[PDB]
Amino acid sequence: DRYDSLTEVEVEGLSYLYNFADGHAYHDINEHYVDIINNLQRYWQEGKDHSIPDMEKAFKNQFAELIDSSTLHSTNHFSVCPTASNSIDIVAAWLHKENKRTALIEPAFDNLYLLLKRRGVDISAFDELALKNEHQLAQIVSSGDIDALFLVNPNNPTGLEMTESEFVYLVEQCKAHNITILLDRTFRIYGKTNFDDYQILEQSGIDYVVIEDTGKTWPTQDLKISLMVYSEAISSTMRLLYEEIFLCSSNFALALLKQFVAVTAKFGVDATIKNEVRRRSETINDALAGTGLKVFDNDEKCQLPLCWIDISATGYDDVSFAARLKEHDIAVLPGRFFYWNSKSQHTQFIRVSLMKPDAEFYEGIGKLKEAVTRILEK
Amino acid sequence: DRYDSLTEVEVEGLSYLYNFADGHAYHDINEHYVDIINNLQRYWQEGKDHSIPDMEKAFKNQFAELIDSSTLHSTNHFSVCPTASNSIDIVAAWLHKENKRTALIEPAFDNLYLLLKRRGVDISAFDELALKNEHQLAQIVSSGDIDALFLVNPNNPTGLEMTESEFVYLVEQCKAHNITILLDRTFRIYGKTNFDDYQILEQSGIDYVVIEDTGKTWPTQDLKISLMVYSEAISSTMRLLYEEIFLCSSNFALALLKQFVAVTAKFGVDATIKNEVRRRSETINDALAGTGLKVFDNDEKCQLPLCWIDISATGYDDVSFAARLKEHDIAVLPGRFFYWNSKSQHTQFIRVSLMKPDAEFYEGIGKLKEAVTRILEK
């Protein structure tokens, strides 16, 4: 009885007709990407015709071109994992080996906490809001209690996203107290920013690891690629840990996702990614309008491919409301596990994932509004 | 000056013209598998049209039919990892969590040792040849110094393989002393035996994990599937640890590798796998005849996609001989790292992997025979 993790809920949700639990990219191949699937053999062949090191660097440089980072394009200190949680787990093992006290962002997707904990890291919580408040952040980094800071930018599920100023300030302060910055950029492509985080990190001279992901952005049936990019000074040990578990990732997966990334650069994030996101976000906001559930929104957040919802006016807590919705064939994520250090004090949110197969999504949202108003009427 | 690991050598080998270092399956798609590549879209579509749980069971059951195990077909106590090292790492986490003193087979591919050590497992070494000598095995199991036994069957790089009676005896002894069995079956399809090891394990009632893999068998550019199968009693905890890292593997990879497994079942292991292995083994044996390099061979071993070579007659140790070959643009693995508890006592072997791209392989074996001749002419 009871749920121990978000992933447990997501596994259960795989059996429901309308699964809004896991936030993995599972929408349909839109018109811009169809030629890739039509030409799967071309990318099979490209992986066959190139060396593993050449394919790693080619995907990395294609990504650096898409995000326009001359610094990512020039660094050779990186590894490629098949999933971003693998990259995180390697970081956790490094954090433990180097005896680094780590403050972890809260809220966060809970397996970030679970992986750090399982590796034996000394973990403290730190408020995501401190990233947009110089005074609070300064108190945290100057305390003498921490050696590393693990962030998710933009953060899941709130969409909190740092400005250039805030990131520069963040990097300035960790440098002054010899703090390593762990940056999970899984949702980077959804950010409304456009600046060179790698350049700011490299110019600074601090120790860092940045983790990228394709899995929350390009729907490739969880055939994924995760760049793990790190500073020169910690490179030798990071690569040693990586090599304990991996020789390389798949050249076929690299060739495939390289072309997803190149197509997004050619037609822009809007035509290929963000326009459908905005339409899905509007569809859920409209469906929930006037129901009492309050979609989490603010002036400064970016639009994650996720909806974070306050249900306090329902009088229900997240697990009980998710249970009632499960009766209607609808699976959503209870939100308390995102508050991994303080679950009991954050029981009023659910999360609804938007990047699901197109028909299941739009039909599912209609079923959700009916379910919410039927549950509320009784 | 020293190498940290076999994987470091393998990564270095990726840059050499004739790379015989890592053992991953990189040979050309043969006549029976070409239709799979011609129909990549069909397997992309199959992944899109089936649920993650249904695809997991479909691959598991296709494999169970291949190996003729009704026990594997009937069990739902399994998870699906993107790589076999990920499965090993989860088992290592389990062993540390349950305080299990583990005896690990020696020799072994060394990242097994490294991953167990990184997870904090209390490791002891145990002679692979104890699996073919009942009183040697009895002493180790009744010692009261271990709670778990980590085996690779058949073993890499010796090709040692347990007979059915040797396995029955091993399980009987483990059950007597309440020892958990961890079985790395990565090289299963190369084995000469065909008995139902899952049935023997499950009916014994002992705790176990079996790890399967596609990457040393089917050439899918390191797009891989690893089945991790385990006893009912530990099934809860194993799944919990799996879910800290993974929600699932890729439905696209599952559909693809299910078809590779199916085609192997349709035409037979010999036609699709073992005949090519025999051809390549005969090539290198012929190349090295009358050189002083003595290919490791014995009556009871199976034919791995690997050639284990005693270079004693050269006067070189493994690392110096490998460095000489590197000058001739040939990369091989020094053997001492496989004897992970006793490296300095085992410096006389090199390993040459066989399942490399076809043209590179046959040309490279010609160049290897030329390099050995020329090196020995001094």
Coordinates of N, CA and C in Angstrom, one line a residue, chain B residues 55-265:
Chain B
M55 N 5.0 -4.6 -24.6 CA 6.3 -4.8 -25.4 C 7.3 -5.4 -24.5
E56 N 7.4 -5.1 -23.2 CA 8.4 -5.7 -22.3 C 8.1 -7.2 -22.3
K57 N 6.8 -7.6 -22.1 CA 6.5 -9.0 -22.0 C 6.7 -9.7 -23.4
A58 N 6.4 -9.0 -24.5 CA 6.6 -9.6 -25.8 C 8.1 -9.9 -26.1
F59 N 9.0 -9.0 -25.7 CA 10.4 -9.3 -25.9 C 10.9 -10.5 -25.0
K60 N 10.5 -10.4 -23.7 CA 10.8 -11.4 -22.8 C 10.4 -12.8 -23.3
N61 N 9.1 -12.9 -23.8 CA 8.6 -14.2 -24.2 C 9.2 -14.6 -25.5
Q62 N 9.5 -13.7 -26.4 CA 10.2 -14.1 -27.6 C 11.6 -14.7 -27.3
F63 N 12.3 -14.1 -26.3 CA 13.6 -14.6 -25.9 C 13.3 -16.0 -25.2
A64 N 12.3 -16.1 -24.4 CA 12.0 -17.4 -23.7 C 11.7 -18.5 -24.7
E65 N 11.1 -18.2 -25.8 CA 10.9 -19.2 -26.9 C 12.2 -19.5 -27.5
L66 N 13.1 -18.5 -27.7 CA 14.4 -18.8 -28.3 C 15.2 -19.8 -27.5
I67 N 15.3 -19.5 -26.2 CA 16.0 -20.4 -25.3 C 15.2 -21.6 -24.8
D68 N 14.0 -21.7 -25.2 CA 13.1 -22.9 -24.8 C 13.0 -23.0 -23.2
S69 N 12.6 -21.9 -22.6 CA 12.4 -21.9 -21.2 C 11.0 -21.5 -20.8
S70 N 10.2 -22.5 -20.4 CA 8.8 -22.2 -20.0 C 8.6 -21.3 -18.6
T71 N 9.6 -21.5 -17.8 CA 9.9 -20.8 -16.6 C 10.1 -19.3 -16.9
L72 N 10.9 -19.0 -17.9 CA 11.0 -17.6 -18.2 C 9.8 -17.0 -18.8
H73 N 9.1 -17.8 -19.7 CA 7.9 -17.4 -20.3 C 6.8 -17.1 -19.3
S74 N 6.8 -17.8 -18.2 CA 5.7 -17.7 -17.3 C 6.0 -16.6 -16.2
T75 N 7.2 -16.1 -16.0 CA 7.5 -15.2 -14.9 C 7.2 -13.8 -15.3
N76 N 6.7 -13.0 -14.3 CA 6.6 -11.6 -14.5 C 7.5 -10.8 -13.5
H77 N 8.4 -11.5 -12.9 CA 9.4 -10.9 -12.0 C 10.7 -10.5 -12.9
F78 N 10.6 -9.4 -13.6 CA 11.7 -9.0 -14.4 C 11.6 -7.5 -14.7
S79 N 12.7 -6.9 -15.0 CA 12.8 -5.5 -15.6 C 13.7 -5.5 -16.8
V80 N 13.6 -4.4 -17.5 CA 14.2 -4.3 -18.8 C 15.1 -3.0 -18.8
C81 N 16.5 -3.3 -18.9 CA 17.5 -2.2 -18.9 C 18.0 -1.9 -20.3
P82 N 18.5 -0.7 -20.5 CA 19.1 -0.4 -21.8 C 20.4 -1.0 -22.1
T83 N 21.1 -1.4 -21.0 CA 22.4 -2.1 -21.1 C 22.5 -3.1 -20.0
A84 N 23.4 -4.1 -20.2 CA 23.6 -5.2 -19.2 C 24.4 -4.6 -18.0
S85 N 25.3 -3.7 -18.3 CA 26.0 -3.1 -17.2 C 25.1 -2.3 -16.2
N86 N 24.0 -1.7 -16.8 CA 23.0 -1.1 -15.9 C 22.3 -2.2 -15.1
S87 N 22.1 -3.4 -15.6 CA 21.5 -4.4 -14.8 C 22.5 -4.8 -13.7
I88 N 23.7 -5.0 -14.1 CA 24.8 -5.3 -13.1 C 24.8 -4.3 -12.0
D89 N 24.8 -3.0 -12.3 CA 24.9 -1.9 -11.3 C 23.7 -2.0 -10.4
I90 N 22.5 -2.3 -10.9 CA 21.4 -2.4 -10.0 C 21.5 -3.6 -9.0
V91 N 22.1 -4.7 -9.6 CA 22.3 -5.9 -8.7 C 23.4 -5.5 -7.6
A92 N 24.4 -4.7 -8.0 CA 25.4 -4.3 -7.1 C 24.8 -3.4 -6.0
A93 N 23.9 -2.5 -6.4 CA 23.2 -1.7 -5.4 C 22.3 -2.6 -4.4
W94 N 21.7 -3.6 -5.0 CA 20.9 -4.5 -4.2 C 21.8 -5.3 -3.2
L95 N 22.9 -5.8 -3.6 CA 23.9 -6.5 -2.8 C 24.4 -5.6 -1.6
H96 N 24.7 -4.4 -1.9 CA 25.1 -3.5 -0.9 C 24.0 -3.2 0.1
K97 N 22.8 -2.9 -0.4 CA 21.6 -2.6 0.5 C 21.3 -3.8 1.4
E98 N 21.4 -5.0 0.9 CA 21.1 -6.2 1.7 C 22.3 -6.7 2.4
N99 N 23.4 -6.0 2.5 CA 24.6 -6.4 3.3 C 25.1 -7.8 2.8
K100 N 25.2 -8.1 1.5 CA 25.5 -9.4 1.0 C 27.0 -9.5 0.7
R101 N 27.8 -10.2 1.5 CA 29.2 -10.5 1.1 C 29.2 -11.4 -0.1
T102 N 29.9 -10.9 -1.2 CA 29.7 -11.5 -2.5 C 31.1 -12.0 -3.0
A103 N 31.1 -13.3 -3.4 CA 32.2 -13.9 -4.1 C 32.0 -13.7 -5.6
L104 N 33.0 -13.1 -6.3 CA 32.8 -12.8 -7.7 C 33.8 -13.7 -8.5
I105 N 33.3 -14.2 -9.6 CA 34.2 -15.1 -10.4 C 35.4 -14.3 -10.9
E106 N 36.5 -15.1 -11.0 CA 37.8 -14.6 -11.5 C 38.4 -15.7 -12.4
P107 N 38.7 -15.4 -13.7 CA 38.6 -14.1 -14.3 C 37.2 -13.6 -14.6
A108 N 37.1 -12.3 -14.8 CA 35.8 -11.6 -15.2 C 36.1 -10.4 -15.9
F109 N 35.2 -9.9 -16.9 CA 35.4 -8.6 -17.4 C 35.3 -7.6 -16.3
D110 N 36.3 -6.7 -16.3 CA 36.6 -6.0 -15.0 C 35.6 -5.0 -14.5
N111 N 34.8 -4.5 -15.4 CA 33.8 -3.5 -14.8 C 32.8 -4.2 -13.9
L112 N 32.6 -5.5 -14.0 CA 31.8 -6.2 -12.9 C 32.4 -5.9 -11.6
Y113 N 33.7 -6.2 -11.4 CA 34.4 -5.9 -10.2 C 34.3 -4.4 -9.8
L114 N 34.6 -3.5 -10.8 CA 34.6 -2.1 -10.5 C 33.2 -1.6 -10.1
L115 N 32.1 -2.1 -10.7 CA 30.8 -1.7 -10.3 C 30.4 -2.2 -8.9
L116 N 30.7 -3.4 -8.6 CA 30.5 -3.9 -7.3 C 31.3 -3.1 -6.3
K117 N 32.5 -2.8 -6.6 CA 33.3 -2.1 -5.6 C 32.8 -0.6 -5.5
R118 N 32.3 0.0 -6.6 CA 31.8 1.3 -6.4 C 30.6 1.4 -5.6
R119 N 29.8 0.4 -5.6 CA 28.6 0.3 -4.8 C 28.9 -0.1 -3.4
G120 N 30.1 -0.3 -3.0 CA 30.4 -0.7 -1.6 C 30.2 -2.1 -1.2
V121 N 30.1 -3.0 -2.2 CA 30.0 -4.4 -1.9 C 31.2 -5.0 -1.3
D122 N 31.1 -5.9 -0.3 CA 32.2 -6.6 0.3 C 32.5 -7.8 -0.7
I123 N 33.6 -7.7 -1.4 CA 33.9 -8.6 -2.6 C 35.0 -9.6 -2.2
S124 N 34.9 -10.8 -2.5 CA 36.0 -11.8 -2.5 C 36.0 -12.5 -3.8
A125 N 37.2 -13.0 -4.1 CA 37.4 -13.7 -5.4 C 37.1 -15.2 -5.3
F126 N 36.7 -15.7 -6.4 CA 36.5 -17.2 -6.4 C 36.8 -17.7 -7.8
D127 N 37.7 -18.7 -7.9 CA 38.2 -19.4 -9.1 C 37.1 -19.9 -9.9
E128 N 37.0 -19.4 -11.2 CA 36.1 -20.0 -12.1 C 36.1 -21.5 -12.2
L129 N 37.3 -22.1 -12.0 CA 37.4 -23.6 -12.1 C 36.8 -24.3 -10.9
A130 N 36.3 -23.6 -9.9 CA 35.6 -24.2 -8.8 C 34.2 -24.6 -9.3
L131 N 33.7 -24.1 -10.4 CA 32.4 -24.5 -10.9 C 32.5 -25.8 -11.6
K132 N 33.7 -26.4 -11.9 CA 33.8 -27.7 -12.5 C 34.5 -28.6 -11.5
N133 N 34.6 -28.3 -10.2 CA 35.2 -29.2 -9.2 C 34.4 -29.1 -8.0
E134 N 33.7 -30.2 -7.6 CA 32.6 -30.1 -6.6 C 33.1 -29.8 -5.2
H135 N 34.3 -30.3 -4.9 CA 34.8 -30.1 -3.5 C 35.4 -28.7 -3.4
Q136 N 36.0 -28.1 -4.5 CA 36.5 -26.7 -4.4 C 35.2 -25.8 -4.2
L137 N 34.1 -26.1 -4.9 CA 32.9 -25.2 -4.7 C 32.3 -25.4 -3.3
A138 N 32.4 -26.6 -2.8 CA 31.8 -26.9 -1.5 C 32.5 -26.1 -0.4
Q139 N 33.8 -26.0 -0.5 CA 34.6 -25.3 0.5 C 34.2 -23.8 0.6
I140 N 34.1 -23.2 -0.6 CA 33.8 -21.8 -0.7 C 32.4 -21.5 -0.2
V141 N 31.4 -22.3 -0.6 CA 30.0 -22.1 -0.1 C 29.8 -22.3 1.3
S142 N 30.5 -23.3 1.9 CA 30.2 -23.7 3.3 C 31.2 -22.9 4.3
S143 N 32.0 -22.0 3.7 CA 32.9 -21.2 4.5 C 32.2 -20.3 5.5
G144 N 31.0 -19.9 5.3 CA 30.3 -18.9 6.1 C 30.8 -17.5 5.9
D145 N 31.6 -17.3 4.9 CA 32.2 -16.0 4.6 C 31.5 -15.2 3.5
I146 N 30.6 -15.9 2.7 CA 29.8 -15.2 1.7 C 28.4 -15.5 1.8
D147 N 27.6 -14.5 1.3 CA 26.1 -14.7 1.3 C 25.6 -14.7 -0.2
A148 N 26.5 -14.4 -1.1 CA 26.0 -14.3 -2.5 C 27.2 -14.7 -3.4
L149 N 26.9 -15.2 -4.6 CA 27.9 -15.7 -5.5 C 27.6 -15.1 -6.9
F150 N 28.6 -14.3 -7.4 CA 28.4 -13.6 -8.7 C 29.2 -14.3 -9.8
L151 N 28.4 -14.9 -10.8 CA 29.0 -15.7 -11.8 C 28.7 -15.2 -13.2
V152 N 29.6 -15.5 -14.1 CA 29.4 -15.2 -15.6 C 29.4 -16.6 -16.3
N153 N 28.3 -16.9 -16.9 CA 28.3 -18.2 -17.6 C 27.6 -18.1 -19.0
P154 N 28.3 -18.5 -20.1 CA 29.8 -18.9 -20.0 C 30.7 -17.7 -19.7
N155 N 31.9 -18.0 -19.2 CA 32.7 -16.9 -18.7 C 33.5 -16.3 -19.8
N156 N 33.8 -15.0 -19.6 CA 34.6 -14.1 -20.5 C 35.9 -13.9 -19.8
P157 N 37.1 -14.2 -20.3 CA 37.3 -14.6 -21.7 C 37.7 -16.0 -22.0
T158 N 37.5 -16.9 -21.0 CA 37.9 -18.3 -21.1 C 36.9 -19.2 -21.8
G159 N 35.7 -18.8 -22.0 CA 34.7 -19.7 -22.5 C 34.3 -20.8 -21.6
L160 N 34.7 -20.8 -20.3 CA 34.3 -21.8 -19.4 C 32.7 -21.8 -19.3
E161 N 32.1 -23.0 -19.3 CA 30.7 -23.1 -19.4 C 30.2 -24.3 -18.5
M162 N 29.2 -24.0 -17.7 CA 28.8 -25.1 -16.8 C 27.9 -26.1 -17.5
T163 N 28.2 -27.4 -17.3 CA 27.3 -28.5 -17.7 C 26.0 -28.4 -16.9
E164 N 25.0 -29.1 -17.3 CA 23.8 -29.2 -16.6 C 24.0 -29.7 -15.2
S165 N 24.8 -30.8 -15.0 CA 25.0 -31.4 -13.7 C 25.9 -30.4 -12.8
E166 N 26.8 -29.7 -13.5 CA 27.6 -28.7 -12.7 C 26.7 -27.6 -12.2
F167 N 25.7 -27.2 -13.0 CA 24.7 -26.1 -12.5 C 23.8 -26.6 -11.4
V168 N 23.3 -27.8 -11.6 CA 22.4 -28.4 -10.6 C 23.1 -28.5 -9.2
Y169 N 24.3 -28.9 -9.3 CA 25.2 -29.0 -8.0 C 25.4 -27.6 -7.5
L170 N 25.7 -26.7 -8.3 CA 26.0 -25.3 -7.8 C 24.7 -24.8 -7.1
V171 N 23.5 -24.9 -7.7 CA 22.3 -24.4 -7.1 C 22.0 -25.2 -5.8
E172 N 22.2 -26.5 -5.8 CA 22.0 -27.3 -4.6 C 22.8 -26.8 -3.5
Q173 N 24.1 -26.6 -3.7 CA 25.0 -26.0 -2.7 C 24.6 -24.7 -2.2
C174 N 24.2 -23.8 -3.1 CA 23.8 -22.4 -2.8 C 22.5 -22.5 -1.9
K175 N 21.5 -23.3 -2.2 CA 20.3 -23.5 -1.4 C 20.7 -24.0 0.0
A176 N 21.6 -24.9 0.1 CA 22.0 -25.4 1.4 C 22.5 -24.3 2.3
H177 N 23.3 -23.4 1.8 CA 23.9 -22.4 2.6 C 23.1 -21.0 2.5
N178 N 22.0 -21.0 1.9 CA 21.2 -19.7 1.7 C 21.9 -18.7 1.0
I179 N 22.7 -19.0 -0.1 CA 23.5 -18.1 -0.9 C 22.7 -17.7 -2.1
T180 N 22.7 -16.4 -2.4 CA 22.0 -15.8 -3.5 C 22.8 -16.0 -4.8
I181 N 22.2 -16.3 -5.9 CA 23.0 -16.5 -7.1 C 22.8 -15.4 -8.1
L182 N 23.8 -14.7 -8.5 CA 23.8 -13.7 -9.6 C 24.4 -14.3 -10.8
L183 N 23.7 -14.3 -11.9 CA 24.1 -15.0 -13.1 C 24.2 -14.1 -14.3
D184 N 25.4 -13.8 -14.8 CA 25.5 -12.9 -16.0 C 25.5 -13.8 -17.2
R185 N 24.5 -13.9 -17.9 CA 24.3 -14.8 -19.1 C 24.5 -14.1 -20.4
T186 N 25.4 -13.1 -20.4 CA 25.6 -12.2 -21.6 C 25.9 -13.1 -22.8
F187 N 26.8 -14.1 -22.6 CA 27.2 -14.9 -23.7 C 26.5 -16.2 -23.9
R188 N 25.2 -16.2 -23.5 CA 24.4 -17.4 -23.5 C 24.3 -18.1 -24.8
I189 N 24.0 -17.3 -25.9 CA 23.7 -17.9 -27.2 C 25.0 -18.6 -27.7
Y190 N 26.2 -18.3 -27.3 CA 27.4 -19.0 -27.7 C 27.6 -20.3 -27.0
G191 N 26.9 -20.6 -25.9 CA 27.1 -21.8 -25.2 C 26.8 -23.1 -26.0
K192 N 27.5 -24.1 -25.6 CA 27.3 -25.4 -26.2 C 26.1 -26.2 -25.6
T193 N 25.7 -25.8 -24.3 CA 24.7 -26.5 -23.6 C 23.3 -25.9 -24.0
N194 N 22.3 -26.7 -23.7 CA 20.9 -26.3 -23.9 C 20.0 -27.0 -22.9
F195 N 20.1 -26.5 -21.7 CA 19.2 -26.9 -20.6 C 18.5 -25.7 -20.0
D196 N 17.5 -25.9 -19.2 CA 16.6 -24.8 -18.7 C 17.1 -24.4 -17.4
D197 N 18.0 -23.4 -17.4 CA 18.6 -22.9 -16.1 C 17.6 -22.1 -15.3
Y198 N 16.6 -21.5 -15.9 CA 15.5 -20.8 -15.2 C 14.7 -21.8 -14.4
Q199 N 14.4 -22.9 -15.0 CA 13.6 -23.9 -14.3 C 14.4 -24.4 -13.0
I200 N 15.6 -24.8 -13.2 CA 16.5 -25.2 -12.1 C 16.5 -24.2 -11.0
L201 N 16.6 -23.0 -11.3 CA 16.7 -21.9 -10.3 C 15.4 -21.7 -9.6
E202 N 14.3 -21.6 -10.3 CA 13.0 -21.3 -9.7 C 12.5 -22.5 -8.8
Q203 N 12.7 -23.7 -9.3 CA 12.2 -24.8 -8.5 C 13.1 -25.1 -7.3
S204 N 14.3 -24.6 -7.3 CA 15.1 -24.7 -6.1 C 14.6 -23.8 -5.0
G205 N 13.9 -22.8 -5.3 CA 13.4 -21.8 -4.4 C 14.4 -20.8 -3.9
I206 N 15.6 -20.8 -4.4 CA 16.7 -19.9 -3.9 C 16.5 -18.5 -4.5
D207 N 17.1 -17.5 -3.9 CA 17.0 -16.1 -4.4 C 18.0 -16.0 -5.6
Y208 N 17.7 -15.3 -6.6 CA 18.7 -15.1 -7.7 C 18.3 -13.9 -8.6
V209 N 19.3 -13.5 -9.4 CA 19.1 -12.6 -10.5 C 19.9 -13.1 -11.7
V210 N 19.2 -13.2 -12.8 CA 19.8 -13.6 -14.1 C 19.8 -12.3 -15.0
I211 N 20.9 -12.1 -15.6 CA 21.1 -10.9 -16.5 C 21.3 -11.5 -17.9
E212 N 20.4 -11.0 -18.9 CA 20.6 -11.3 -20.3 C 21.1 -10.1 -21.0
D213 N 21.5 -10.2 -22.3 CA 22.0 -9.1 -23.0 C 21.9 -9.4 -24.5
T214 N 21.8 -8.4 -25.3 CA 21.8 -8.5 -26.8 C 23.1 -8.1 -27.4
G215 N 23.9 -7.2 -26.7 CA 25.0 -6.5 -27.3 C 26.3 -7.3 -27.7
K216 N 26.4 -8.5 -27.2 CA 27.6 -9.3 -27.6 C 27.1 -10.3 -28.6
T217 N 25.9 -10.2 -29.1 CA 25.3 -11.2 -29.9 C 24.7 -10.7 -31.2
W218 N 23.8 -9.7 -31.1 CA 23.2 -9.1 -32.3 C 23.7 -7.7 -32.6
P219 N 24.1 -7.5 -33.8 CA 24.8 -6.2 -34.1 C 23.9 -5.1 -34.3
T220 N 23.5 -4.3 -33.3 CA 22.5 -3.3 -33.4 C 23.1 -1.9 -33.0
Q221 N 24.4 -1.8 -33.2 CA 25.1 -0.5 -33.0 C 24.9 0.0 -31.5
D222 N 25.0 -1.0 -30.6 CA 24.9 -0.7 -29.2 C 23.5 -0.1 -28.8
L223 N 22.5 -0.3 -29.7 CA 21.1 -0.2 -29.3 C 20.7 -1.5 -28.7
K224 N 20.6 -1.6 -27.4 CA 20.7 -2.9 -26.7 C 19.5 -3.1 -25.8
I225 N 19.2 -4.3 -25.4 CA 18.2 -4.7 -24.4 C 18.8 -5.7 -23.4
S226 N 18.7 -5.4 -22.1 CA 19.1 -6.3 -21.1 C 17.9 -6.7 -20.2
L227 N 17.5 -8.0 -20.3 CA 16.6 -8.5 -19.3 C 17.3 -8.8 -18.0
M228 N 16.6 -8.3 -16.9 CA 17.1 -8.6 -15.5 C 15.9 -9.4 -14.9
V229 N 16.2 -10.7 -14.6 CA 15.1 -11.5 -14.1 C 15.5 -12.0 -12.7
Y230 N 14.5 -12.1 -11.8 CA 14.8 -12.3 -10.4 C 13.7 -13.1 -9.7
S231 N 14.1 -13.6 -8.5 CA 13.1 -14.5 -7.8 C 12.1 -13.6 -7.1
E232 N 10.9 -14.3 -6.9 CA 9.8 -13.6 -6.3 C 10.1 -12.9 -5.0
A233 N 11.0 -13.5 -4.2 CA 11.2 -13.0 -2.8 C 11.9 -11.7 -2.8
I234 N 12.8 -11.4 -3.8 CA 13.6 -10.2 -3.8 C 13.0 -9.2 -4.8
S235 N 11.9 -9.6 -5.5 CA 11.3 -8.9 -6.6 C 10.9 -7.5 -6.3
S236 N 10.3 -7.2 -5.2 CA 10.0 -5.8 -4.7 C 11.0 -4.6 -4.6
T237 N 12.0 -5.2 -4.0 CA 13.3 -4.4 -3.7 C 14.0 -4.2 -5.1
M238 N 14.1 -5.3 -5.8 CA 14.9 -5.1 -7.1 C 14.2 -4.1 -8.0
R239 N 12.8 -4.2 -8.0 CA 12.1 -3.2 -8.9 C 12.2 -1.8 -8.4
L240 N 12.1 -1.6 -7.1 CA 12.4 -0.3 -6.5 C 13.7 0.3 -6.9
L241 N 14.7 -0.5 -6.9 CA 16.1 0.0 -7.2 C 16.1 0.3 -8.7
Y242 N 15.5 -0.6 -9.6 CA 15.4 -0.3 -11.0 C 14.7 1.0 -11.2
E243 N 13.6 1.3 -10.6 CA 12.8 2.5 -10.8 C 13.5 3.7 -10.3
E244 N 14.5 3.6 -9.5 CA 15.2 4.9 -9.1 C 16.0 5.5 -10.3
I245 N 16.3 4.6 -11.3 CA 17.0 5.1 -12.5 C 16.1 5.1 -13.7
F246 N 15.2 4.1 -13.9 CA 14.5 3.9 -15.1 C 13.0 3.8 -14.9
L247 N 12.3 4.5 -15.8 CA 10.9 4.2 -16.0 C 10.7 3.0 -16.9
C248 N 11.4 2.9 -18.1 CA 11.3 1.8 -19.0 C 12.5 1.9 -19.9
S249 N 12.7 0.9 -20.7 CA 13.5 1.0 -21.9 C 12.7 1.4 -23.1
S250 N 13.3 1.4 -24.3 CA 12.7 2.0 -25.5 C 11.8 0.9 -26.2
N251 N 10.5 1.2 -26.4 CA 9.7 0.4 -27.1 C 10.2 0.1 -28.5
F252 N 10.9 1.1 -29.1 CA 11.4 0.9 -30.5 C 12.6 -0.1 -30.4
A253 N 13.5 0.0 -29.4 CA 14.5 -1.0 -29.3 C 14.0 -2.4 -29.0
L254 N 12.9 -2.4 -28.1 CA 12.3 -3.7 -27.8 C 11.8 -4.4 -29.1
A255 N 11.0 -3.6 -29.9 CA 10.4 -4.2 -31.1 C 11.5 -4.7 -32.1
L256 N 12.6 -3.8 -32.2 CA 13.7 -4.2 -33.1 C 14.4 -5.5 -32.7
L257 N 14.8 -5.5 -31.4 CA 15.6 -6.7 -31.0 C 14.7 -7.9 -30.8
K258 N 13.4 -7.7 -30.6 CA 12.5 -8.9 -30.6 C 12.6 -9.5 -32.0
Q259 N 12.7 -8.7 -33.1 CA 12.7 -9.3 -34.4 C 14.1 -10.0 -34.7
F260 N 15.2 -9.4 -34.2 CA 16.5 -10.1 -34.3 C 16.4 -11.4 -33.6
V261 N 15.8 -11.5 -32.4 CA 15.7 -12.7 -31.7 C 14.8 -13.7 -32.5
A262 N 13.7 -13.2 -33.0 CA 12.8 -14.0 -33.8 C 13.4 -14.6 -35.0
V263 N 14.2 -13.8 -35.7 CA 14.9 -14.3 -36.9 C 15.9 -15.4 -36.6
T264 N 16.6 -15.2 -35.5 CA 17.6 -16.2 -34.9 C 16.8 -17.5 -34.6
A265 N 15.6 -17.4 -34.0 CA 14.8 -18.6 -33.8 C 14.4 -19.3 -35.1

